[PDB]
Ligand binder design. Structure first.
Ligand code: HEA
Ligand code: HEA
Ligand SMILES: CCCCCCCCCCO[C@@H]1O[C@H](CO)[C@@H](O[C@H]2O[C@H](CO)[C@@H](O)[C@H](O)[C@H]2O)[C@H](O)[C@H]1O
Ligand SMILES: CCCCCCCCCCO[C@@H]1O[C@H](CO)[C@@H](O[C@H]2O[C@H](CO)[C@@H](O)[C@H](O)[C@H]2O)[C@H](O)[C@H]1O
Ligand SMILES: CCCCCCCCCCO[C@@H]1O[C@H](CO)[C@@H](O[C@H]2O[C@H](CO)[C@@H](O)[C@H](O)[C@H]2O)[C@H](O)[C@H]1O
Ligand SMILES: CCCCCCCCCCO[C@@H]1O[C@H](CO)[C@@H](O[C@H]2O[C@H](CO)[C@@H](O)[C@H](O)[C@H]2O)[C@H](O)[C@H]1O
Ligand SMILES: CCCCCCCCCCO[C@@H]1O[C@H](CO)[C@@H](O[C@H]2O[C@H](CO)[C@@H](O)[C@H](O)[C@H]2O)[C@H](O)[C@H]1O
Ligand SMILES: OC[C@H]1O[C@H](O[C@H]2[C@H](O)[C@@H](O)[C@@H](O)O[C@@H]2CO)[C@H](O)[C@@H](O)[C@@H]1O
Ligand SMILES: CCCCCCCCCCCCC
Ligand SMILES: CCCCCCCCCCCCC
Ligand SMILES: CCCCCCCCCCCCC
Ligand SMILES: CCCCCCCCCCCCC
Ligand SMILES: CCCCCCCCCCCCC
Ligand SMILES: CCCCCCCCCCCCC
Ligand SMILES: CCCCCCCCCCCCC
Ligand SMILES: CCCCCCCCCCCCC
Ligand SMILES: CCCCCCCCCCCCC
Ligand SMILES: CCCCCCCCCCCCC
Ligand SMILES: CCCCCCCCCCCCC
Ligand SMILES: CCCC[C@@H](O)[C@@H](O)CO
Ligand SMILES: CCCC[C@@H](O)[C@@H](O)CO
Ligand SMILES: CCCC[C@@H](O)[C@@H](O)CO
Ligand SMILES: [Ca+2]
Ligand SMILES: [Cu+2]
Ligand SMILES: [Cu+2]
Ligand SMILES: [Cu+2]
Ligand SMILES: [Mg+2]
Lengths: 256, 535
């Protein structure tokens, strides 16, 4: 499997998209980016021009105007128009994100200190996922020869340390996955940047997210709500595979 | 002598706030140096558990030298304590005490022609609660805390059940610290409002009050509504921890998300409590060095009132991923976007004031120009974060961290430096050397931008907040960010040298108004320093 959902050295953009929701996030962000970059460039050019054109040694007699209602009204309506344009493209994207469709696959995720528990109710499958290098795997949350060998044995490399887990959440490609997130002790947060999803794992509440992976591969996330000493050491691994390989994974878990 | 600390004159209290806020600022900034030492390279090299087995003072010095990964057992609790201490000190014991308690106590009475504040004895008590709260916050770092170590590693907002289950009593000390801080802010707010309304000089109507005194006035109202709410939230944390209540524990029918509603109801107003006094300083500074009165004085006053009112109905943009419905996500997203309109009115008015003036680029003006550019950068990323569909990716990432350092460390702090260089001659009778203030500005401008602009890249790449360590792919921009922080720290030590030089052997100020005629407020008609009895 190709490692797709992960940060890259020196990266400055989003992680690669692998869902339609993530694609909507990239486009809405790029749309908002070009206008706020225009606003800041506009503001910066005005300041630098005014300092140059109205410096003391070039304009020795300062003006005294305090009013200019047509300008003052122009720089009030134009931002309102700009913001309404943003909300016009943004609210549909948010409605698409938060409206949970019908599930082809359902996973119930529970956040613990410090690991994730996964449960497939339709399949009666349940397991826990720990960082490779955590105490559960024999380490103490740092790189070591034993940890690197464990990463290689699991199908990763030294570069995936702090992202790779001993077990992965496996889902079929091009299927609607609905994830139910909750916390068991303190608040955690389950996220996969490549999917454009993030939901806090609150004790006593069961929240929902959804994604449809558009290609196979490996996708990483990291707990995104401070939860104690090993907050930085309980990541998320999602493997998107073919419908056949998914069933194969399911059958390997069935008890006869 | 000790007559500094027992005074009740508003000028001496403001100086005590300024100096104390500066020293607490030095402590918190030193925390960030250590933080950025550890984030400079992947793998943990400084915060090793092995340093715990040595002395409290011996392990401190060992903590400052890097160890190899094979000899460094990662200690995430110390990281969580450092960033919690850094955030608590800044938000409660640095910038607001310096802008509100310092420049607000010193210059708001002078700006309205009042001889002192309505309750000078109460104003002296407010400073001592601030110092008491600062002491409890520092003491929590050395008190038994989470994971059988010292200190609370729970974040500056104290989310439960993490904050309510953290062992030890370090968290209780932190809550008492925030209680004392809010009491200090409330006493100060009562004094600003009563003096603003009852002790204005004859002929000084409200449409004649300068913009800085207006900014302090609006800020004082926000404090009176936001900081009692926070006192309730953190008291419910104290009873869940110590008195058997279950406000935020699901086993007893509680809801941790309820706390986030109460805390963020204070949490966003607190953020406009920080920046409003900086807005007023920028107005006075830009009008002085552009040699032109401020453009649109009345929209400037209203825009600050509009910003202060809207800041109370947008709090849930801190909870887009906490389980809020689509309808609440949609309202708070649209309500948050509105704040950009009154803020933009002030930004464009500041450029309008420069337009057609005779601009001198002295040090206070440099800070104000940097404020305009850098606050705009932070403000537009806040608009990005206001879009809940995009905040889904950015929440709890370093993109948020980049946002709020541009508006606070490169905005509100730039207003603090603007006010210091603008007023140190008036407050002390001694002038700062112009070349050094300019070198401080450019060092801070370059270093603070190198620190925080790359954190936009880290956030877009998905680096989460509050991590002691990070995947290898984040190494490059973390390295640049740490270098900028070290340069920024050098600029602050240099600034402390500039302040020490100014106060001990700086050029003697002789003029009542050492700037120019367009510094047209009442403090520039008095001596430098003003007499021990005003008006
Ligand atoms: C000085 C303190 C300060 C100030 C002034 C602000 C100002 C703003 N902030 Fe920020 N913010 C913080 C401090 C501050 N913030 C802190 C500390 C956090 C993190 C808290 C934590 O979790 O610890 C935070 C986090 C934060 C979040 C939560 C994000 C998350 O956690 O996921 C959001 C969400 O909407 C946000 C948005 C805004 C907006 C819209 C403004 C607006 O007020 C800005 C408006 C200004 C401009 C827009 C620029 C000028 C305008 C123009 C030039 C006009 C043209 C502009 C347009 C047309 C857009 N802030
Ligand atoms: C005003 C608020 C403020 C200021 C000034 C700063 C300043 C700095 N901060 Fe920040 N920071 C926060 C508020 C602030 N911070 C908050 C609220 C958090 C959240 C904590 C949490 O997650 O719980 C945070 C967290 C935080 C993080 C994220 C940590 C994490 O998630 O793990 C980082 C990352 O590097 C960091 C670094 C720095 C650095 C390098 C500086 C500075 O070194 C930059 C250089 C600036 C200076 C050198 C000058 C500073 C001047 C003053 C402070 C004025 C005082 C002076 C006088 C009165 C004269 N800070
Ligand atoms: C104005 C004053 C401001 C004070 C600023 C203080 C700056 C101190 C710099 C620390 O020194 C560096 O620390 C790195 C650790 O992050 C080391 O990285 C190297 O050494 C580590 C081993 O300890 C390896 O794990 C790293 O991968 C490798 O990059 C590196 O050798 C070392 O020189
Ligand atoms: C990081 C911190 C930032 C620093 C902020 C700016 C520093 C504040 C100014 C220093 O304080 C001033 O020092 C003057 C020294 O001259 C005092 O004058 C005083 O001098 C005599 C005492 O020396 C008194 O009798 C007089 O009343 C009085 O004019 C004055 O009262 C005092 O306010
Ligand atoms: C912890 C980190 C600390 C980092 C410290 C960085 C040190 C940089 C200091 C450079 O040295 C100074 O440079 C100035 C060059 O401008 C000189 O001022 C000179 O130039 C000024 C303006 O040009 C004149 O007003 C002065 O009289 C004249 O001394 C000044 O003499 C000289 O000492
Ligand atoms: C990490 C700690 C860093 C500490 C940084 C210290 C910052 C303060 C340094 C101020 O330097 C002074 O600047 C003056 C310029 O304003 C110089 O006066 C010079 O310039 C004046 C104006 O021309 C002359 O009248 C003077 O005689 C002449 O000495 C003076 O020499 C120089 O020492
Ligand atoms: C009171 C409680 C504790 C307070 C802590 C504050 C400590 C800061 C001490 C800094 O004092 C400055 O040190 C510089 C030397 O170290 C001197 O600059 C000197 O060196 C600079 C750099 O070379 C030159 O630019 C200057 O001209 C030259 O005066 C400067 O005169 C002096 O005032
Ligand atoms: O993504 C498009 C989106 O369209 C509709 O959502 C509307 C909603 O119905 C209106 O109330 C409006 O105010 O907000 C949304 C603007 O698009 C569909 O209801 C929704 O399912 C669909 O995703
Ligand atoms: C990959 C970028 C190298 C560091 C750039 C410094 C600015
Ligand atoms: C693929 C490169 C993306 C780089 C985008 C830079 C984002 C910078 C965010 C700051 C906002 C600028 C106004
Ligand atoms: C994914 C990139 C989206 C590009 C959107 C372009 C919007 C054009 C705005 C008009 C020009 C303003 C400077
Ligand atoms: C409890 C098992 C969780 C999954 C472990 C890693 C995934 C196994 C590979 C799935 C099929 C890949 C083609
Ligand atoms: C010297 C007082 C300021 C502290 C500077 C920050 C250094 C933090 C080191 C922490 C060591 C762990 C005990
Ligand atoms: C090659 C052995 C290590 C050399 C680097 C040591 C850097 C120590 C920096 C200490 C900084 C204290 C503020
Ligand atoms: C006696 C336990 C502490 C009570 C604090 C106030 C709880 C009431 C809820 C109010 C929340 C603040 C508005
Ligand atoms: C003093 C203001 C406190 C915040 C009010 C509490 C809001 C609770 C929202 C509950 C929403 C449930 C759907
Ligand atoms: C965003 C702040 C930019 C300020 C530009 C200042 C230019 C200074 C030119 C030199 C002036 C004589 C020292
Ligand atoms: C009279 C000369 C003007 C003084 C300028 C001092 C600042 C020089 C630029 C320093 C840039 C450091 C990055
Ligand atoms: C791989 C070793 C990197 C060591 C870099 C140390 C940088 C310290 C520079 C301090 C600069 C302060 C302005
Ligand atoms: C200024 C108000 C902005 C709100 C706007 O973006 C949306 O509500 C329009 O759909
Ligand atoms: C592909 C194998 C599916 C077998 C199915 O019965 C189990 O998932 C149920 O335990
Ligand atoms: C002080 C300037 C007031 C101007 C303002 O009332 C109007 O021009 C804005 O609509
Ligand atoms: Ca490190
Ligand atoms: Cu967690
Ligand atoms: Cu966590
Ligand atoms: Cu907010
Ligand atoms: Mg969160």
């Amino acid at each position: 499997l190709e490692i797709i959902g992960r940060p890259q050295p020196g990266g400055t953009g989003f992680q690669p998209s692998a869902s339609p929701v993530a694609t909507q996030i990239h486009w809405l962000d790029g749309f908002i980016l070009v206008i706020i970059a225009a606003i800041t460039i506009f503001v910066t050019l005005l300041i630098l021009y005014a300092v140059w054109r109205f410096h003391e040694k070039r304009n020795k007699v300062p003006a005294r105007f305090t009013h200019n209602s047509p300008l003052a009204i122009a720089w009030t309506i134009v931002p309102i128009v700009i913001l309404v344009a943003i909300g016009a493209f943004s609210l549909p994207v948010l409605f698409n994100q938060q409206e949970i469709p019908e599930a082809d696959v359902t996973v119930k995720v529970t956040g613990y200190q410090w690991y994730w528990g996964y449960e497939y109710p339709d399949e009666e499958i349940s397991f826990e996922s720990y960082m490779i290098g955590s105490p559960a795997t024999g380490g103490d949350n740092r790189m070591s020869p034993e940890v690197e060998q464990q990463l290689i044995e699991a199908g990763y490399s030294r570069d995936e340390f702090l992202l790779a887990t001993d077990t992965a959440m496996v889902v079929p490609v091009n299927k609607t996955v609905v994830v139910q997130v909750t916390g068991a002790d303190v608040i955690h947060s389950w996220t996969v940047p490549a999917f454009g999803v993030k939901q806090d794992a609150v004790p006593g509440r069961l929240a929902q997210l959804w994604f449809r992976a558009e290609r196979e591969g490996i996708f990483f996330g990291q707990c995104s709500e401070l939860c104690g000493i090993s907050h930085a050491y309980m990541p998320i691994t999602v493997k998107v595979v073919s419908e056949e390989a998914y069933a194969a994974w399911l059958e390997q878990h069935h008890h006869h | 002598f000790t007559r500094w600390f027992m005074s009740t004159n508003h000028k001496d209290i403001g100086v005590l706030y300024l100096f104390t806020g500066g020293l607490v600022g030095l402590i918190s900034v030193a925390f960030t140096v250590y933080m950025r030492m550890e984030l400079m390279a992947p793998g943990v090299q400084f915060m090793c558990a092995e340093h715990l087995e040595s002395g409290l003072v011996k392990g401190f010095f060992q903590s400052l030298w890097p160890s190899a990964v094979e000899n460094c057992t990662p200690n995430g609790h110390l990281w969580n304590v450092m960033i919690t201490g850094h955030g608590i000190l800044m938000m409660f014991f640095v910038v607001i005490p310096a802008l509100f308690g310092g420049f607000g106590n010193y210059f708001m009475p002078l700006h309205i022609g009042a001889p002192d504040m309505a309750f000078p004895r109460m104003n002296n008590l407010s400073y001592w609660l601030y110092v008491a709260g600062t002491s409890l916050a520092v003491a929590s770092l050395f008190a038994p805390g989470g994971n059988g170590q010292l200190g609370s590693g729970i974040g500056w907002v104290l989310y439960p059940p993490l904050s309510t289950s953290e062992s030890g009593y370090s968290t209780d000390l932190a809550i008492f610290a925030v209680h004392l801080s809010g009491a200090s802010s409330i006493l100060g707010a009562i004094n600003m409002i009563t003096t603003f309304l009852n002790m204005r000089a004859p002929g000084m109507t409200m449409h004649k009050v300068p913009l800085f005194a207006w900014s302090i006035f609006v800020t004082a109202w926000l404090i009176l509504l936001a900081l009692p709410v926070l006192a309730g939230a953190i008291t419910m944390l104290l009873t869940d921890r110590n008195f058997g209540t279950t406000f935020f524990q699901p086993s007893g029918g509680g809801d941790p998300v309820l706390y986030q509603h109460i805390l963020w109801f204070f949490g966003h107003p607190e953020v406009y409590i920080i920046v409003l006094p900086a807005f007023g300083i920028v107005s006075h500074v830009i009008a002085t060095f552009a040699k032109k009165p401020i453009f649109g004085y009345l929209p400037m006053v209203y825009a600050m009132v509009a910003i202060g009112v809207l800041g109370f109905v947008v709090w849930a943009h801190h909870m887009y991923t906490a389980g809020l419905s689509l309808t609440q996500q949609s309202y708070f997203m649209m309500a948050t976007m509105v704040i950009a309109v009154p803020t933009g009115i002030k930004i464009f008015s500041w450029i309008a004031t420069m337009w057609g003036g005779s601009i001198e680029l002295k040090t206070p003006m440099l800070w104000a120009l940097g404020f305009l550019f850098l606050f705009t950068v932070g403000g537009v990323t806040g608009i990005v974060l206001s879009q809940a569909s995009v905040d889904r990716y950015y929440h709890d990432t370093y993109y948020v961290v980049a946002h709020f350092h541009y508006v606070m460390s490169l905005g509100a702090v730039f207003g603090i430096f603007a006010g210091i260089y603008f007023w140190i001659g008036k407050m002390s009778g001694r002038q700062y050397p112009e070349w050094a203030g300019k070198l401080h500005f450019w060092m801070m401008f370059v270093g603070a931008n190198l620190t925080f602009f790359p954190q936009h890249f880290l956030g877009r790449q998905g680096m989460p907040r509050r991590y002691i360590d990070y995947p290898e792919a984040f190494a490059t921009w973390n390295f640049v960010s740490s270098l900028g922080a070290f340069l920024s720290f050098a600029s602050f030590l240099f600034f402390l040298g500039v302040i020490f030089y100014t106060l001990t052997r700086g050029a003697r100020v002789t003029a009542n108004n050492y700037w120019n005629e367009h510094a047209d407020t009442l403090e520039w008609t008095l001596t430098s320093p003003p007499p021990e009895h005003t008006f």
